């Protein structure tokens, strides 16, 4: 009630908001990042993600990637939560600057739906210029778990609650 939203679906609701913000006042949830193949989180909500773990978001990833090697696009993995969320489920968005397809959005969204309550960003529409409607159209079809979809920006959330 305390925040711009509005409810797509039975599982999809779009919230003009802050992401850690949102799933910190979810009693139970998965914070969703959109990370790269290396879970390098430099910048982005990576980056905001790890800032407000202090860094411990970073430490547990390099130890993941520095055992296990890149991620695939496409793919996730499931990591602890460090107070933000119950676990961060990193997944790879497409990049299309390296020309990755948006269709691997799929893959991304299909990841979702295992757990009960999921609070994501739009996968892919940062600097991976994907086009948020296109994202949002990947998350709809694919997503059949309630799920708390957060853009911080007013014009992309006017364009998509259309
Ligand atoms: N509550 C919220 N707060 C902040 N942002 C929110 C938000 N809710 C949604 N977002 C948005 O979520 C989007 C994520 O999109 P991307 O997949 O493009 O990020 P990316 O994969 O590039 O990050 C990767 O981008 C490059 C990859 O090389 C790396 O540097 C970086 O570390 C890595 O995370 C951004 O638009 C971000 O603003």
Same mark, same amino acid.
């Given at each position: ?14 919230? $003009? ?19 790269? #193949?290396? $879970? ?66 799929? #893959? ?55």
């Amino acid at each position: 009630s305390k925040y711009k939203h509005t409810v797509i679906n039975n599982s999809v609701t779009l919230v $003009l908001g802050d992401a850690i913000q949102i799933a910190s006042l979810l009693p139970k949830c998965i914070l969703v990042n959109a990370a790269n #193949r290396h $879970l390098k989180h430099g910048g982005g909500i990576a980056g905001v993600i790890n800032k407000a773990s202090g860094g411990d978001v970073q430490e547990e990833s390099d130890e993941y990637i520095s055992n296990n090697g890149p991620l695939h696009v496409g793919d996730s993995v499931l990591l602890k939560g460090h107070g933000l969320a119950d676990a961060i489920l990193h997944v790879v968005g497409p990049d299309a600057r390296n020309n990755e397809d948006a269709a691997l959005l799929k #893959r991304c969204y299909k990841a979702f739906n295992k757990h009960t309550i999921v609070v994501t960003p739009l996968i892919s529409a940062g600097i991976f210029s994907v086009d948020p409607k296109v994202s949002f159209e990947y998350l709809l079809a694919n997503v059949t778990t309630t799920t708390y979809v957060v853009v911080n920006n007013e014009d992309i959330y006017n364009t998509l609650a259309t």
